[PDB]
Design an enzyme around this catalytic site. Structure first.
Site, short mmCIF file in Angstrom:
data_model
loop_
_atom_site.label_atom_id
_atom_site.label_comp_id
_atom_site.label_asym_id
_atom_site.label_seq_id
_atom_site.Cartn_x
_atom_site.Cartn_y
_atom_site.Cartn_z
N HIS A 184 83.69 -14.30 76.19
CA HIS A 184 85.13 -14.02 76.19
C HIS A 184 85.80 -14.26 74.83
O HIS A 184 86.98 -13.95 74.70
CB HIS A 184 85.90 -14.70 77.34
CG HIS A 184 86.04 -16.20 77.23
ND1 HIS A 184 86.88 -16.78 76.29
CD2 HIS A 184 85.52 -17.17 78.01
CE1 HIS A 184 86.80 -18.09 76.50
NE2 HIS A 184 85.99 -18.37 77.52
N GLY A 202 90.90 -24.43 73.65
CA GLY A 202 89.99 -24.55 72.52
C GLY A 202 88.66 -25.22 72.86
O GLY A 202 87.75 -25.22 72.03
N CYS A 212 86.45 -24.21 75.05
CA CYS A 212 85.42 -23.25 75.43
C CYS A 212 84.22 -23.28 74.48
O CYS A 212 84.40 -23.40 73.27
CB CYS A 212 86.00 -21.85 75.57
SG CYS A 212 87.35 -21.74 76.77
N1 QFU Z 1 85.75 -17.06 81.23
C1 QFU Z 1 86.88 -17.13 81.09
C2 QFU Z 1 88.31 -17.22 80.95
C3 QFU Z 1 89.14 -16.42 81.73
C4 QFU Z 1 90.50 -16.63 81.73
C5 QFU Z 1 91.05 -17.62 80.93
C6 QFU Z 1 90.24 -18.41 80.11
C7 QFU Z 1 90.84 -19.48 79.23
C8 QFU Z 1 90.72 -20.87 79.83
O1 QFU Z 1 90.64 -21.06 81.04
N2 QFU Z 1 90.76 -21.86 78.91
C9 QFU Z 1 90.75 -23.25 79.13
C10 QFU Z 1 89.59 -24.02 79.25
N3 QFU Z 1 89.57 -25.34 79.46
C11 QFU Z 1 90.73 -25.97 79.55
C12 QFU Z 1 91.99 -25.33 79.46
C13 QFU Z 1 93.22 -26.03 79.56
C14 QFU Z 1 94.41 -25.36 79.46
C15 QFU Z 1 94.43 -23.99 79.27
C16 QFU Z 1 93.27 -23.28 79.16
C17 QFU Z 1 92.00 -23.93 79.25
C18 QFU Z 1 88.87 -18.19 80.12
#
Ligand code: QFU
Ligand code: CL
Lengths: 305, 301
Positions: free
Chosen positions: B41, B143, B145
């Protein structure tokens, strides 16, 4: 989201762990530059620990009595000295993996990461707090002596603890990296008992702010309290008194969540007198006190090392 | 003595963390030999979040669209490919800090350490379990990921997880290092919900044995139970059913403490019925389920 007990990355410390053997005793040493630090009790036999004269035992040792092993390479000891309860073995080779480091003595309530080692090999890393009774509630087996506690400030490792012993209650006692014990403990096989432990109040408050940042807000209430009324209540429940320094340190979290420190203190006061009522805060049924305000800011803001 | 939630030392993994940038998106990558693994992604824009066609988006990218940074050194991408939900960026430099490693896919209930990273820099290390609903209860911010889950066997790092996303409930979803998601999750912004989480029963039992080894005996009782009667009770408290495999795996702890598994199962039934009554087990007021039987033996012996 999420809140976990989180240790600092242990890589900078793992590159310093070595095995130190003196006679039949084998424990861990911390290799920084051309010096290996380890507990001075490594020079003791079974009789010695009962009533040791460390100055007399060290004088009887030669550099060849100490075997230092870093990975599969034997380091040669070219000198030995004692600083308080820590033995310093001068080696002929400077540790090429020596990070930017500093020796710091911590206060009760402060947290740090422990890199538990056996035979100079790192086996686990966990986060703990120096209890108000100066013990740490660690997880250590025989051979873990010499394992170190640390924090990471920017790219600088601050070594704050070295493991020396386990008290009869299963709690642990150790020294700073200058060999000074935390607490009223001595390095002798003798009856020793930690004082009654108390809760680290500023850390509980910081953890309540971490819960509010994570959306767990059921314990919040309309009330506030004076710092004096809060301390009168907290002291009765074996909680450490909260000072004006603690209130100031909780300021950034107070501004971030919109809950004044004395407003959160009235939430804590209610939680102490009434309990959780079957509810949990961050998945816990007890108030957690091993996260400092700095830890909560670091974890809820993403500071890296 | 003592029992702590303990992560593996993270040094072998820290030496693999790099920062991966594609356009405006920056996340973490795992640099092993001459390949950097990261969530696919990273190639998505705002328009490609609900329904991305990753094969189409990757074909449109060139090696110069990916910026890989390891410390203060920019690595040159000389190739790119996709394996399931992971992007593999071939670099022109083998990581000199590459440890002995292996990719393993874990089962629910299994534990691992997470090295949380931001911009390719390790910021913390914690311990997790793969929940029965295939999510992990991590601690991640934007961040994170590309942050990885691992275990260490002697000198070998078994990579078992890579962080991809946060679900609406604050729990986390990710893949193994071959890009296969754990659970019914997809790397899309489409509505996704984890199933109701349940307690990892075999891990609670292992933790009750850890408590006995450490001197706790207050929850013990003179009862035993059949595995079927235990499962009928446990299921009512949203606990996972205990299989004969779980009973066998708890065998060494049972022999070490002198408490048969079904004897310990009756203690667990009682704790579920009564609660703790102001008592704690290993300093905890709740039953802990993020220590496997293997973790308990490792830490206690
Ligand atoms: N595969 C995938 C994917 C799909 C939709 C969205 C996303 C982005 C996502 O979920 N990021 C995050 C990760 N880990 C913690 C996060 C805390 C706050 C905000 C975003 C966080 C990733
Ligand atoms: Cl602060």
């Amino acid at each position: 989201s999420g809140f976990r007990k989180m240790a600092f990355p242990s890589g900078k410390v793992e590159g310093c762990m070595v095995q130190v053997t003196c006679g039949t005793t084998t424990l861990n040493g911390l290799w920084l530059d051309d010096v290996v630090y380890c507990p001075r009790h490594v020079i003791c036999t079974s009789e010695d620990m009962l009533n040791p004269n460390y100055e007399d035992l060290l004088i009887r040792k030669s550099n060849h009595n100490f075997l230092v092993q870093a990975g599969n390479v034997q380091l040669r000891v070219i000198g030995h000295s004692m600083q308080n309860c820590v033995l310093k073995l001068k080696v002929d080779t400077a540790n090429p993996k020596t990070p930017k480091y500093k020796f710091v003595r911590i206060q009760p309530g402060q947290t740090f990461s422990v890199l538990a080692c056996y035979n100079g090999s790192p086996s686990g890393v966990y986060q703990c707090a120096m209890r108000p009774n100066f013990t740490i509630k660690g997880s250590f087996l025989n051979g873990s002596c010499g394992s170190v506690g640390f924090n990471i400030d920017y790219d600088c490792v601050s070594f704050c603890y070295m493991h020396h012993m386990e008290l009869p209650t299963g709690v642990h006692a150790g020294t700073d990296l200058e060999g000074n014990f935390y607490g009223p403990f001595v390095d002798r096989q003798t009856a020793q008992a930690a004082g009654t432990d108390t809760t680290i109040t500023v850390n509980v408050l910081a953890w309540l702010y971490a819960a509010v940042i994570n959306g767990d807000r059921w314990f919040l209430n309309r009330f506030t309290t004076t710092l004096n009324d809060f301390n009168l209540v907290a002291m009765k429940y074996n909680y450490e008194p909260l000072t004006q320094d603690h209130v100031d340190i909780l300021g950034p979290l107070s501004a971030q969540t919109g809950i004044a420190v004395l407003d959160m203190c009235a939430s804590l006061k209610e939680l102490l007198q009434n309990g959780m009522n079957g509810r949990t805060i961050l998945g816990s049924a007890l108030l957690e006190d091993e996260f400092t305000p700095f830890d909560v800011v670091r974890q809820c803001s993403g500071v890296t090392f």
